[PDB]
Amino acid sequence: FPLRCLQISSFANSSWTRTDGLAWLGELQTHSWSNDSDTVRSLKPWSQGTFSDQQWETLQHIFRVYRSSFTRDVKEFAKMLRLSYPLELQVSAGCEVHPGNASNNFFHVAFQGKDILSFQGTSWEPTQEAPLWVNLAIQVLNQDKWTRETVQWLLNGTCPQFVSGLLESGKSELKKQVKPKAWLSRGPSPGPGRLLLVCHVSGFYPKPVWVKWMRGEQEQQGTQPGDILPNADETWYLRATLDVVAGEAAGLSCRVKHSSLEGQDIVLYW
Amino acid sequence: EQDPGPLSVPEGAIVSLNCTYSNSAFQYFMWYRQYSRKGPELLMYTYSSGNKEDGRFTAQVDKSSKYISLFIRDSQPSDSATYLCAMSGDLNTNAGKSTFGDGTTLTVKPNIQNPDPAVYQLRDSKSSDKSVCLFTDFDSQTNVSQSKDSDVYITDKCVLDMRSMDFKSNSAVAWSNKSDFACANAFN
Amino acid sequence: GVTQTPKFQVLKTGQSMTLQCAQDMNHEYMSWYRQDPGMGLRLIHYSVGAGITDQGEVPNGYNVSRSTTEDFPLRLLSAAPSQTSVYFCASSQGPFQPQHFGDGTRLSILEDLKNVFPPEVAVFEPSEAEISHTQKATLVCLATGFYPDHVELSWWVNGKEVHSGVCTDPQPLKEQPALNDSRYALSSRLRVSATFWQNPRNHFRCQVQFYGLSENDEWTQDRAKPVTQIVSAEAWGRAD
Amino acid sequence: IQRTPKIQVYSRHPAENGKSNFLNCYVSGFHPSDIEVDLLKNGERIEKVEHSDLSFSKDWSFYLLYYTEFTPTEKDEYACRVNHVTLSQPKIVKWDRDM
Ligand SMILES: CCCCCCCC/C=C\CCCCCCCCCCCCCC(=O)N[C@@H](CO[C@H]1O[C@H](CO)[C@H](O)[C@H](O)[C@H]1O)[C@H](O)[C@H](O)CCCCCCCCCCCCCC
Ligand SMILES: *[C@@H]1O[C@H](CO)[C@@H](O)[C@H](O)[C@H]1NC(C)=O
Ligand SMILES: *[C@@H]1O[C@H](CO)[C@@H](O)[C@H](O)[C@H]1NC(C)=O
């Protein structure tokens, strides 16, 4: 269950800006952070974890200052490094607490889709394929030791402390099981004597699922799974397919294995 | 996270004042000076492990050994004040906000040079009946003793300094409203 | 900087008192500390931003407000002798940045206000012995019988305030060690070269700013009222 | 203009003519963030449409889930109008019952 703090900073020009954040614990979104709000919105009844209201106000202040500072920094770097707008900046920081002592952390920042730099040990280190101006910005960024120190204890101390808290308060919600409903259909036939068999599976929590076409006990090699697409409710949807000749359609079935299915897999024949 | 009690160091000597924060995980460390009848004044602020110089003041930090210190090189009697230390960054101690130590009082005794044993009597201006003599040019090694008699009243050791002549003098004043008050009898 | 109002105040038990605090630095965080001999700085209340206040270490007997992000006033509803202290206002940019402290406020909560008295200021002329053996004259001043310890002593030479050759006792001594509401006494010494004392043209003045009951407060006692007054004693330099 | 979006339209529960359902249009894997998604009912855009918080996958590409409460019929057709800086013309991906 890793914590991923996502940041999306849009800079249309020298005036217009919009930096929005959001946080995920595992597959569930725990926090929301809109450019309009001065507060970090908690989406789950346990999003504050074990942190007291005072601790939570202190962290809230850090992000408030971070947001303001980061924006004036990108703007100052645009002028200094002579970079043209629009600019798209994303920051992906966080950690994962391992059972039952260790915990690794990360802080990656990307520019115009591709990675540019990340915090490594005590300082900002650039990616190998980063543009030569990133090296020039690291020179400025690393000079400020106060931020290099503030990021360092927040990732090594506060992130794991927070994760441990969220895991304790949200345990039940993170361990919840929602049974999926599955049904079959006839896909668009790409051949005159060929039919694409389709297996629909939706409403399953958590995300990990195994949906594969079967003859009997024997697996189907040509099983083409889809993307595990999300629902409005924190559930998911999958659509596994298999292209076979009209005569081979008889006897074929599709097995579905899910943590909610208490051993009893959904076996739907054609 | 605190520091200890009183210290008395002679002029131009290196003063070592330290704070320990075991067991807490502070990140940013402050140092303050507070003179009598005044408010605290920030000396130094350091967030990183190691030393930072600022004139006659060195602020050493050890995040590993969990102890911080302030060194005053060639200390002047000007430095005589209370030295308060505060620490921040620990999200578990006052949710990150600074935690203050109890405080350390410091007294820097002046370089006497020429000593003079004298206690002359001084008559008042407007009222020419009242009298109170002062035992000026006292020794640094000599401590001002408090009076045992309710009638007699003596003041603590005080050091005056001249900005032009660069002269310092340890003076103590004594006064009483008793029938026939003697200078020699008052000093004890 | 931080400027707290007032500097001194003497009040009676169970009386309301709001001591003001200003900050122009645009700091989010603001705090109220009280300092007593031994315990040091104890947090009363703190404000992390406008419309947000929380309890400190010793928050009982006190009220706080943060209507704006510049003013943080401390209020005492029923003031008691347990609140007779030195109050400090501190403002900080953030929870980790260093604080900027005010000059402090001295509070005197008395059960009976009959104990309030201004200081009797008298300047003692320098001795001929210290002017003939050391060739340096030291004029010492003594202000006796004042309660509470809410005074400010200053040395003025020829109209202008002086700081060189000046030394005032930091902790004033009480006349009676048994009595809790005992009058205080403070001594101050001014040392000037033989050429300055002998000159009859130069003038020496010593002012003591006392902080007592305002003309707005009642005074049923037959004796003279102890108001906020500057009690000063004059001394003229002589050649012989 | 760096990465073109992936538009996929699907219902919450298995389609049944008459009963209430939820229509999901999942605009996946695009870059930059600026995207204009409008779910339509027989050509005209559905006014009361909600959407998740704009987020990005590991590869830094963005993803969004546009959803609304609706009712399916044999006559009525649904789709989502997606316009990005990569798309030279707003792409309209029709909702299929079978797929
Ligand atoms: C524990 C986690 C709990 C999770 C809860 C859920 C959160 C909500 C969800 C998502 C949040 C969004 C994801 C981002 C996470 C990052 C967390 C912020 C903590 C970092 C501390 C930085 C200190 C600071 O603020 N630093 C500022 C201010 O520093 C100045 O003031 C200080 C006192 O305030 C000191 O005086 C100091 O010396 C001085 O520099 C810097 O300006 C900084 O450079 C900002 C930018 C840092 C990011 C650097 C990366 C940017 C590189 C790209 C630039 C290239 C531009 C190309 C045009
Ligand atoms: C910046 O962009 C916004 C629209 O995104 C526009 O309204 C504004 O005029 C622009 N400002 C400048 C200085 O280009
Ligand atoms: C984003 O927030 C800032 C204040 O932090 C505001 O000035 C700006 O107008 C906002 N931009 C948008 C596009 O909402």
Author numbering:
A (entry chain C): 8 to 277
B (entry chain A): 5 to 32, 39 to 61, 66 to 68, 74 to 207
C (entry chain B): 3 to 31, 39 to 61, 66 to 72, 74 to 81, 83 to 255
D (entry chain D): 1 to 99
What text does the study give?
The CD1 family of MHC-class I-like molecules present an array of endogenous and foreign lipids Ags that are recognized by specialized T-cell populations. Here we describe a diverse population of CD1d–α-GalCer reactive cells that we termed ‘atypical NKT cells' because they lack the invariant TRAV10+TRAJ18+ α-chain and the TRBV25-1 β-chain that are inherent to type I NKT cells. Crystal structures of two of these atypical NKT TCRs in complex with CD1d–α-GalCer showed that, in contrast to type I NKT cell TCRs that dock over the F′-pocket of CD1d–α-GalCer, these atypical TCRs docked orthogonally over the A′-pocket of CD1d–α-GalCer. Thus, variations in the CD1d–α-GalCer-reactive NKT TCR repertoire can manifest in alternative docking strategies on CD1d and diverse reactivity towards CD1d-restricted lipids.
Next, to establish how atypical NKT TCR usage manifested in CD1d–Ag recognition, we determined the crystal structures of the 9C1 TCR-CD1d–α-GalCer and 9B2 TCR-CD1d–α-GalCer ternary complexes to 2.5 and 3.1 Å resolution, respectively. The 9B2 TCR also sat over the A′-pocket of CD1d with a docking angle of ∼110° across the Ag-binding cleft. Thus, while the overall position of the 9B2 TCR α-chain was similar to the 9C1 TCR α-chain atop CD1d (centre of mass (COM) difference of 0.5 Å), the 9B2 TCR β-chain was located more towards the extreme end of the CD1d A′-pocket, with a COM difference of 13 Å and rotational difference of 35° compared with the 9C1 TCR β-chain. In comparison, the BSA at the 9B2 TCR-CD1d–α-GalCer interface was 720 Å2. In the 9B2 TCR ternary complex, the TCR α-chain chain mediated most of the interactions with CD1d–α-GalCer (BSA 64%), within which the CDR3α loop, the characteristics of which are also distinct from the TRAJ18-encoded CDR3α loop, was the principal contributor to the interface (32% BSA). The CDR1α (BSA 15%) and CDR2α (BSA 12%) made exclusive contacts with the α2-helix of CD1d, whereupon Tyr32α wedged between Trp153 and Trp160 and hydrogen bonded to Thr157 and Trp160; Trp160 also packed against Gln31α. Central to the CDR3α loop-mediated contacts was Leu110α, which sat within the central axis of the Ag-binding cleft and formed vdw contacts with Asn62, Leu66, Trp160 and Thr165. Regarding the 9B2 TCR β-chain interactions, the CDR3β loop was the principal contributor to this interface (BSA 20%), as the CDR1β and CDR2β loops played lesser roles (7 and 5% BSA respectively). The CDR3β loop was positioned between the α1- and α2-helices, where Phe111β plugged a hydrophobic-lined cavity formed by Thr65, His68, Ile69 and Trp160. While, in the 9B2 TCR ternary complex, the interactions with the α-GalCer moiety were extremely limited, namely, Gln112β solely contacted the 6′-OH of α-GalCer.
